[PDB]
């Protein structure tokens, strides 16, 4: 699209990137654990 | 094409967001499957 230079631009991307990271890192972790306990070793004991 | 200024910010975020989504969606899926086969419950799959 457009590859220009600007202290703002760089900062902008850094902001969005970080945000997307945290959000995902949250939904992910929760998921891993979600299925973790869900398995409950075959059936409930 | 178009070499003007307008609604750039909005477009910028939309670009970064989407990118972060795809990348993560890749590392995630691969992970889920990674441990999936790793378990090799009983016999190797």
Q: Which chain B residues are Cβ-neighbours of A21 within 8 angstroms? A: 20, 24
Classify burial at B28, counting beta carbons within 10 Å of its beta carbon; exposed 0-12, middle 13-18, buried 19 or more: middle
Grouping H, G, I as helix, E, B as strand and the rest as coil, residue B40 is coil
H or E, element range at B20: helix B8-38
* A37 min Cα distance to partner chain B (Å): 15
- For this PDB entry, the determination method is NMR
A18 and chain B in contact, CB less than 8 A: no
């Amino acid at each position: 699209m457009t590859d220009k230079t600007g202290r703002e631009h760089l900062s902008v991307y850094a902001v969005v990137v970080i945000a997307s990271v945290v959000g995902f890192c949250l939904l992910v972790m929760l998921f891993l654990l979600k299925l973790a306990r869900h398995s409950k070793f075959g059936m409930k004991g």
